[PDB]
């Protein structure tokens, strides 16, 4: 939408978020990193 | 008590009884998944239903879930005397700082 | 999955108490943990959560600043340290293994708990 | 949730002053923070917000570019750096802990405030 | 001062007094939640009402409120001498960058 | 809010030229930016907008495909990349800070612009 | 030119002159807020009017706007020599891939 | 690249069996490894993963707490220790080399597998 | 069987056949890349195609595929007798603890 | 060939010529710094640009570059006969096991 | 910085050949090294890397298991052992000094290279 | 003194008292093991606790301790009159040149 | 110069002056600790501030400082004539091979 | 703590010069050392380091390969040998004792330096 309202919005809940998977995520490159 | 539950439910063996949980826009109609636990008088609560309709392989097909709007529900069919227990809903209320919220808890009495 | 709890007992008000949930049957370090409590005659109250590596901790508003949650990954053990116990803190405390589904989470294994009483 | 303002005093106009708030009894790193101010004889004016991890900083239009907000989570401390203070910036500055309800937010806990006077 | 408040309100203890808070389509009629704070002469403002009707457990039930359209208010029933204070409403203005916006404040004098 | 513009000058047609708008007095990363242009003897033509994080890139059809808008938040700078410039692209280019009231956008502050001349 | 504007307006110092802007269902009657800019001859077209009637503190209290349906308007009272400028209205064309549209621009000449 | 399994055979339920996979043609220590199994009439089941440096391990829920995965870089060997074998653990076990694409991973090289029968 | 596959497909040499996988919002519609494996009657699975579209080294251009919504697909053109085989999808499912999930597997029969 | 470069560019002495380098979400858009090297017809290549915009002290201000999205570029101003060379870009592709990836390389011809 | 390739020549396919680089002008032991190659008429291909202390090695996929990289800090020498040379391995090989910028690395002081031809 | 200890603690015989020791990331949160010593009014300090939880055979089980984050503590149960003593914590501080660092010591007074 | 310092600062005796040191993502905002040195007109530099806020016992409390983001600052309060000196900041730039990097120094003149 | 320097003077370019720093008041063998230099009218340039046991040396890019740093623990002496001095190497050289805080290091004690001039 070319006429959406821009910029960064205030009015949010900036108090971390206690609703997320607290477990280890088994989905990452398991290989050594050559970089 | 975040989720509203009746304090009691009952029926004779062989009957179908239901336990409902009612929340609001902060915790059921919010799109948050609803879970159920069953507690027997002498132990820790056991997971009965997860993901609104899914259940552990340790749960017989007597139990099923449902979800619509701000309402959620547990149905028990083929009620047995051994199903006497305290049933609880669990969800997440976006207005609260914790991870889990629970309902009041409903006590199911089987009229044996 | 086997969760074992110990550390309850009776303390005078104002005293501290340390609870410990020993675990086995799964890889402890790959999961976060929860504590809930059930006062006699009451339903369930969520108390605290700790992230698999201790990077995050959350507490129920009713206990924040009074209770501390911690892990010892090396000994497969979950701890809850309560300071300044109040009468209102009398309950059976239970540990649980964290699980998560999609938009919200859940526990899927529970210890048997231990009883903490705060009394004259 | 104890918040403690510190750092007020008298500033010759044109000079800077740094304010800060120390906190305790809750996990500082899990919450965002706010500063507001009240000039004597006036109502409340929102000044600035910082998110729990510093990812966002918003300022009242009346102070943006003159005031800077920052945090040190390891010290449980919130800072406000005011440069080029104007006489109009005289106010009691307060800290509050960020909170949020549904479609809008609010502060829940408040400190007591400290006074910055900008005058020759 | 984007939320209009009367500069003054008063009444005898035992009476009911209200403080209005009137905004525009940008800050009350915008769907934002109205909050109320009480300031006593020698300290910081403290939260009375949040979410238009809810309140901290430290607030006696004398205080309540509501909203409709661009109007909102705080009512004090059973007014006590101890309720003398400066009351402020708070919201969020769609057109502004600040997280919080305030009303102009109202001074409540208890006539007794 | 302060916007500073440069990079104009005469370039042969078919060649590239790029402009920049340096900004200060506000947080660059909290606002989107616009480029607009005014050909000599003509009114003002809108050219492009970029959002604060690069998430939106809109162009007038008259410039789309030759003009690219970009920004670098670490440099507080807005850039305009013009490729294969036409004589018709001669214009004073101006940057402006994005703003809106309720239903439409607007510039709430303007830089002074710079002149790009495209000529044999 | 997207928004219709007359090419010229004029009057003597001290007089009131007006500038018109007219659109359609795609850009004024459309519901898009119509703003005005003042292109003083040696600079950028700074914002003059916003919110159809409001203005920046950088604008003399000479200027005001108006909007009804497809008819947008700018009034200049107490006209000064320094008000010579190209005035533009601005809105958003429902069929525009870009974000802003301007009117043709009206040239204000001060007769003195 | 050659991945070669060893150690299958027939074991009464309750007893243990140890599998291994020897590898060559590549630097063993730079890659993670996977074990999968295929029951004799079924499709493929993921069993376990080990992180190239041994820091992480994950197991299928069907085997967690019963199976252990490990590496010995000096022998270019991957091991799988299965305790308390159950009848349902009968399958051909295969090793495979971890690979990763973007949002998910995959195995690229596969061994031949070896058969483990749990019975009588 | 996290991903659903038909148990069997077939066609005559020279024909085009497809094998497909249907997932859901936790795995394919969730954006996790789909990979496919081929198993011949007496061997270990071999990577056939990965990253939704890439053929490794020795896989001939007979095989191609795609990802759309929760669907994924493997197309085989110019079906040959040597293509008789078992084909499988592989992906990641956010609701499970394992790194990989597989579909049930589809057998392709060439109608020689 | 991981990064795409045009095979050939040219221009007359004194003109400006640019050489593009295009990657993707795996290696430029991804956030990896882009580097450039210059190979004269009978020598070993040497670093020309590093860190997207920086350059060794032995490089005259004729050369500069940029990074934007998945695009990268080397610009040569004041083109001289002595600038004839093969130019190469370099980055790091997350999907590959190596450390460096190169583009195809571009030959710059000066139209003397 | 002096980097000098040596040990090239022509071999029948299937033969081995060892390349090495002598160096001075800098402390060899403090830097990692790279090998790259350029087949005649072709662009550049990265071949291998070795860490400053020899602890890690990575290879281009096209050569892994066929090529070995090593070094001797006490002789200021970098080595590459090529086994089972294929026709496709014909190229000029170069030594380069590792450098690193931020999110990616680069080389900055290469040698002249030496030609290895594999042919019957 | 880099470890923080209260200067004094007390309690009646039969009570449980604790003595804290708090550091930073340089000496407790750092991962360095914490040790405790007991000093009686006319003697040399004696090792009480080592390795955070272990103790020499000369120490009755009255004493135990823990370490968590930057906090460490000595717990004394079954407090006796004979436990009056100074207690000191000890660790290693990565920012200093010395092998050992201490807290300032806490005096425990038993309220007989 | 790696770190940016203004070349000059001044003030009257008794005034407060500050000296800035601005770096970037490679050396201050990178988490590296900033240090400051004082050089008197005809001698070797002296460590003034270390660890961003700490100072040697040989430094009067006139000097203090802190670091935020990529900008470090040395504050000098109660400026005396004897505080006229060259001040330098120091950090570590991860992109460079050297252990230490310096700014260009700032010369503080006391306006006696 | 004393750091005493000697060895400055003037040489024509191309020639070598050796500097040394004698120390006392502390155990030399327990600390690493640094050299920095200050050209007249200029700020400070880090030149070189050398861990306590001589195991590691690092040099500024501007001097590596031209300067050598070494030490003799038995004489409490730090040496710097400069070869092929350039005009650009004119500066006052200073020794300093290495110290380290947390994420970066610093010098604490400084000698008074000596002047090395390189000139036709």
Author numbering:
A (entry chain E): 1 to 35
B (entry chain U), E (entry chain V), G (entry chain W), I (entry chain T), J (entry chain S), L (entry chain Q), ...: 2 to 9, 11 to 27, 27A, 27B, 27C, 28 to 95, 95A, 95B, ...
C (entry chain J), D (entry chain K), F (entry chain M), H (entry chain I), K (entry chain G), N (entry chain F): 2 to 52, 52A, 53 to 82, 82A, 82B, 82C, 83 to 100, 100A, ...
Provide passages from the article that reported this PDB entry:
The circumsporozoite protein (CSP) on the surface of Plasmodium falciparum sporozoites is important for parasite development, motility, and host hepatocyte invasion. For many years, the leading target for vaccine design has been the major surface protein of sporozoites, the P. falciparum circumsporozoite protein (PfCSP), which contains a central region consisting of multiple NANP repeats that can vary (from 25 to 49) among different P. falciparum isolates. In addition, PfCSP contains a flexible N-terminal domain with a heparan sulfate binding site for hepatocyte attachment and a structured C-terminal domain with a thrombospondin-like type I repeat (αTSR). Here, the cryo–electron microscopy structure at ~3.4-Å resolution of a recombinant shortened CSP construct with the variable domains (Fabs) of a highly protective monoclonal antibody reveals an extended spiral conformation of the central NANP repeat region surrounded by antibodies.
To decipher the architecture of the rsCSP-Fab311 complex at high resolution, we used single-particle cryo-EM. Eleven copies of the crystal structure of Fab311-(NPNA)3 could be fit into the EM map, and the rsCSP-peptide complex was then assembled in COOT to generate an initial model. In the cryo-EM map, however, two additional Fabs were observed, demonstrating that 11 Fabs can bind simultaneously to rsCSP, although the density for the N- and C-terminal Fabs was sparse. The repeat region of rsCSP is well defined with continuous cryo-EM density and forms an unusual extended spiral structure, from which multiple Fab311 antibodies radiate tangentially in a pseudo-helical arrangement, consistent with our previous nsEM reconstruction. In addition, no density was observed for the N-terminal or C-terminal αTSR domains of rsCSP, likely due to flexibility. The angular twist between Fab variable domains is ~77° with respect to each other, where 4.7 Fabs (360°/77°) are required to complete one full turn of the spiral. We observe a wider radius of 13.4 Å, a length of 145 Å, and a much larger pitch of 49 Å (9.5 NPNA repeats). To complete a full turn on the spiral, a fifth Fab needs to partially pack underneath the first Fab, thereby making the pitch similar to the width of Fab311 along the longitudinal axis of the spiral (44.7 Å; LGly68 to HSer74 Cα-Cα distance). Furthermore, we observed that Fab311 is able to bind the NVDP repeats, thereby increasing the available epitopes on rsCSP from 15 (NPNA only) to 22 (including the DPNA and NPNV repeats). Unexpectedly, the Fab domains make specific interactions not only with the NANP repeat region but also with neighboring Fabs along the NANP spiral surface.
